Design an enzyme around this catalytic site. Structure first.
Site, PDB file in Angstrom:
ATOM      1  N   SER A 110       9.744-108.252 -40.067  1.00 51.70           N
ATOM      2  CA  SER A 110      10.985-107.776 -40.651  1.00 51.70           C
ATOM      3  C   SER A 110      10.773-107.554 -42.136  1.00 51.70           C
ATOM      4  O   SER A 110       9.938-108.208 -42.766  1.00 51.70           O
ATOM      5  CB  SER A 110      12.150-108.756 -40.440  1.00 51.70           C
ATOM      6  OG  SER A 110      11.996-109.898 -41.261  1.00 51.70           O
ATOM      7  N   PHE A 147      12.003-102.277 -43.628  1.00 48.04           N
ATOM      8  CA  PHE A 147      12.020-101.395 -42.471  1.00 48.04           C
ATOM      9  C   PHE A 147      12.975-101.859 -41.377  1.00 48.04           C
ATOM     10  O   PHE A 147      13.067-101.191 -40.344  1.00 48.04           O
ATOM     11  CB  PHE A 147      10.606-101.288 -41.899  1.00 48.04           C
ATOM     12  CG  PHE A 147       9.942-102.624 -41.705  1.00 48.04           C
ATOM     13  CD1 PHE A 147      10.189-103.379 -40.568  1.00 48.04           C
ATOM     14  CD2 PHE A 147       9.098-103.142 -42.679  1.00 48.04           C
ATOM     15  CE1 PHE A 147       9.593-104.623 -40.400  1.00 48.04           C
ATOM     16  CE2 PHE A 147       8.492-104.382 -42.516  1.00 48.04           C
ATOM     17  CZ  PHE A 147       8.741-105.122 -41.374  1.00 48.04           C
ATOM     18  N   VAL A 172      11.728-105.812 -36.242  1.00 54.06           N
ATOM     19  CA  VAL A 172      10.989-105.191 -35.147  1.00 54.06           C
ATOM     20  C   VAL A 172      10.570-106.269 -34.160  1.00 54.06           C
ATOM     21  O   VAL A 172       9.950-107.267 -34.550  1.00 54.06           O
ATOM     22  CB  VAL A 172       9.761-104.417 -35.656  1.00 54.06           C
ATOM     23  CG1 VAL A 172       9.022-103.780 -34.480  1.00 54.06           C
ATOM     24  CG2 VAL A 172      10.188-103.361 -36.655  1.00 54.06           C
ATOM     25  N   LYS A 177      12.942-101.592 -32.849  1.00 57.27           N
ATOM     26  CA  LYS A 177      13.246-101.668 -34.271  1.00 57.27           C
ATOM     27  C   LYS A 177      14.747-101.545 -34.498  1.00 57.27           C
ATOM     28  O   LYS A 177      15.375-100.575 -34.049  1.00 57.27           O
ATOM     29  CB  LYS A 177      12.519-100.572 -35.056  1.00 57.27           C
ATOM     30  CG  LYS A 177      12.918-100.556 -36.527  1.00 57.27           C
ATOM     31  CD  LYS A 177      12.354 -99.350 -37.281  1.00 57.27           C
ATOM     32  CE  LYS A 177      10.938 -99.592 -37.730  1.00 57.27           C
ATOM     33  NZ  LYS A 177      10.531 -98.614 -38.790  1.00 57.27           N
ATOM     34  N   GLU A 198       6.597 -96.625 -29.263  1.00 56.57           N
ATOM     35  CA  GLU A 198       5.367 -96.964 -28.554  1.00 56.57           C
ATOM     36  C   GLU A 198       4.799 -98.281 -29.057  1.00 56.57           C
ATOM     37  O   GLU A 198       4.913 -98.618 -30.236  1.00 56.57           O
ATOM     38  CB  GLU A 198       4.305 -95.881 -28.755  1.00 56.57           C
ATOM     39  CG  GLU A 198       4.573 -94.579 -28.060  1.00 56.57           C
ATOM     40  CD  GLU A 198       3.428 -93.603 -28.265  1.00 56.57           C
ATOM     41  OE1 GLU A 198       2.940 -93.479 -29.423  1.00 56.57           O
ATOM     42  OE2 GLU A 198       3.009 -92.981 -27.263  1.00 56.57           O
ATOM     43  N   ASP A 210       5.016 -93.063 -47.699  1.00 54.99           N
ATOM     44  CA  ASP A 210       4.666 -94.476 -47.828  1.00 54.99           C
ATOM     45  C   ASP A 210       3.368 -94.760 -47.089  1.00 54.99           C
ATOM     46  O   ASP A 210       3.236 -95.780 -46.404  1.00 54.99           O
ATOM     47  CB  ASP A 210       5.797 -95.381 -47.325  1.00 54.99           C
ATOM     48  CG  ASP A 210       5.667 -96.821 -47.822  1.00 54.99           C
ATOM     49  OD1 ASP A 210       4.899 -97.065 -48.788  1.00 54.99           O
ATOM     50  OD2 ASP A 210       6.330 -97.711 -47.239  1.00 54.99           O
TER      51      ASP A 210
HETATM   52  O1  8UB Z   1       7.648 -99.042 -36.597  1.00 55.91           O
HETATM   53  C1  8UB Z   1       7.168-100.172 -36.629  1.00 55.91           C
HETATM   54  N1  8UB Z   1       7.345-101.002 -37.684  1.00 55.91           N
HETATM   55  C2  8UB Z   1       6.856-102.306 -37.748  1.00 55.91           C
HETATM   56  C3  8UB Z   1       7.076-103.111 -38.859  1.00 55.91           C
HETATM   57  C4  8UB Z   1       6.630-104.424 -38.847  1.00 55.91           C
HETATM   58  C5  8UB Z   1       5.975-104.932 -37.741  1.00 55.91           C
HETATM   59  C6  8UB Z   1       5.729-104.130 -36.639  1.00 55.91           C
HETATM   60  C7  8UB Z   1       6.158-102.800 -36.637  1.00 55.91           C
HETATM   61  N2  8UB Z   1       5.890-102.009 -35.539  1.00 55.91           N
HETATM   62  C8  8UB Z   1       6.328-100.774 -35.520  1.00 55.91           C
HETATM   63  C9  8UB Z   1       5.967 -99.947 -34.429  1.00 55.91           C
HETATM   64  C10 8UB Z   1       5.138-100.158 -33.416  1.00 55.91           C
HETATM   65  C11 8UB Z   1       4.221-101.143 -32.886  1.00 55.91           C
HETATM   66  C12 8UB Z   1       3.355-100.931 -31.842  1.00 55.91           C
HETATM   67  C13 8UB Z   1       2.513-102.054 -31.620  1.00 55.91           C
HETATM   68  C14 8UB Z   1       2.773-103.079 -32.462  1.00 55.91           C
HETATM   69  S1  8UB Z   1       4.026-102.729 -33.546  1.00 55.91           S
END
Ligand code: 8UB
Lengths: 9, 273
Positions: B14, B17, B20, B35, B89, B135
Site C-alpha cells: 500500500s 498507489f 493492493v 487494487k 494480472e 513514473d
Molecule cells: O498495480 C500494482 N501495484 C502494486 C503496488 C504495490 C504492490 C503490488 C502491486 N501490484 C500491482 C499489480 C500487479 C501484480 C502482479 C503480481 C504481483 S503484484
C-alpha cells in the site's frame, strides 16, 4: 550506503 | 459484483498507489491483483467512451491493456461508493525490480541489457497507445521470474501523451529530469528518457545516481561500479542536461551497448532460475 525506496503519487 | 467473483488474499502493498491485495478469480482460479484506490485521493479524472467518469489510471490502463505487452494488464474494474477497485494480472512467481537489485546488487551488464531492452519495448508500447507513464522506476517494474519477462505497473501518475509542455508532475522526484526541478516544465518523451537513464544506472551500479536536487541539475554522473565504456556513454546520453540532447527511443535501442539482447526465456534460464 543506504539504498531506499522513494514514494510517488 | 466484486465480492463474489474474486477470493481475496494477503495485502501485497500500500502507498500512494492505493492498497493492493493478492487474489484469485473464482471463475477459473486465475491469479489476480486487486487494487483499491480511494476516490478522495484521485487527482486526475477521465472519461471512458461510455462517458462514465473514472480515474485517469483506468483510462490509461485500458489504452495499454489490449493484446500482449510488457504492461500488467487491467482485466476488470468496479466502482464502489468511496473507491474504485482494479483487477490486474498477477504473474507468479514475481519480484519487483527494486527488491531484485537490493538483493542481487549491481546487475551483470548482460542482465541489465535484457531488462532495459524489455522496459524500452514496454514504454514504446505505452507511447504508441497514447500513454505516458511518468513514473518509470525499478519499484514500478515486476519481474516474472520463471518467464524472464518484465511488466510495468502503477500508472497512477501517468497522463495522456501530448506534444506540448507538461507543467504538473506527481511521479518520483529522484527520477524526474532537471527541467522539472528547475522550471516545473518538461516534455513527455525526453522526460521519460531521463528516467530511463536513471533506471539503467540503477541496474548496473546497484542504486540510483542522484538523491538531491543539486545532483539532478548538476549534470555529473559518477560511476560507483565498474561499468563498460559503451554502457556509460548510453547512460550519460540519456542523462543529458538539455532535453533535446537526449536520445530518442530508436537511438537508445540502436546504441552499440544494446545489441545482441537475450531472449526472455534465455534471461530466465541464465540469470533467474
Ligand atoms: O498495480 C500494482 N501495484 C502494486 C503496488 C504495490 C504492490 C503490488 C502491486 N501490484 C500491482 C499489480 C500487479 C501484480 C502482479 C503480481 C504481483 S503484484
Amino acid at each position: 550506503r543506504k539504498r531506499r525506496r522513494h514514494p510517488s503519487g | 459484483p466484486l465480492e463474489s467473483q474474486y477470493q481475496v488474499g494477503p495485502l501485497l502493498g500500500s502507498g500512494g498507489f492505493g492498497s493492493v491485495y493478492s487474489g484469485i478469480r473464482v471463475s477459473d482460479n486465475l491469479p489476480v491483483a486487486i487494487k483499491h484506490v480511494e476516490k478522495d485521493r484521485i487527482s486526475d479524472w477521465g472519461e471512458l467512451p461510455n462517458g462514465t467518469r473514472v480515474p485517469m489510471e483506468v483510462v490509461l490502463l485500458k489504452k495499454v491493456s489490449s493484446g500482449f505487452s510488457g504492461v500488467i494488464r487491467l482485466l476488470d474494474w468496479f466502482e464502489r461508493p468511496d473507491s474504485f477497485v482494479l483487477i490486474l494480472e498477477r504473474p507468479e512467481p514475481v519480484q519487483d525490480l527494486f527488491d531484485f537489485i537490493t538483493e542481487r546488487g549491481a546487475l551483470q551488464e548482460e542482465l541489465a541489457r535484457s531488462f532495459f531492452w524489455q522496459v524500452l519495448e514496454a514504454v514504446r508500447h505505452c507511447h504508441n497507445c497514447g500513454v505516458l507513464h511518468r513514473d518509470i522506476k525499478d519499484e514500478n517494474i515486476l519481474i516474472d521470474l520463471n518467464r524472464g519477462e518484465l511488466k510495468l505497473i502503477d500508472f497512477g501518475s501517468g497522463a495522456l501523451l501530448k506534444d506540448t509542455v507538461y507543467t504538473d508532475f506527481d511521479g518520483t522526484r529522484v527520477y524526474s529530469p532537471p527541467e522539472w526541478i528547475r522550471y516545473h516544465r518538461y516534455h513527455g518523451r525526453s522526460a521519460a528518457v531521463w528516467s530511463l537513464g536513471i533506471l539503467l544506472y540503477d541496474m548496473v551500479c546497484g542504486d540510483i545516481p542522484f538523491e538531491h536536487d543539486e545532483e539532478i541539475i548538476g549534470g555529473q554522473v559518477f560511476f560507483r561500479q565498474r561499468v563498460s565504456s559503451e554502457c556509460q556513454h548510453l547512460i550519460r546520453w540519456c542523462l543529458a542536461l538539455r532535453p533535446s540532447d537526449r536520445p530518442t527511443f530508436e537511438e537508445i535501442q540502436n546504441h552499440p551497448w544494446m545489441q545482441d539482447v537475450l531472449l526472455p526465456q534465455e534471461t530466465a534460464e541464465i540469470h533467474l532460475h
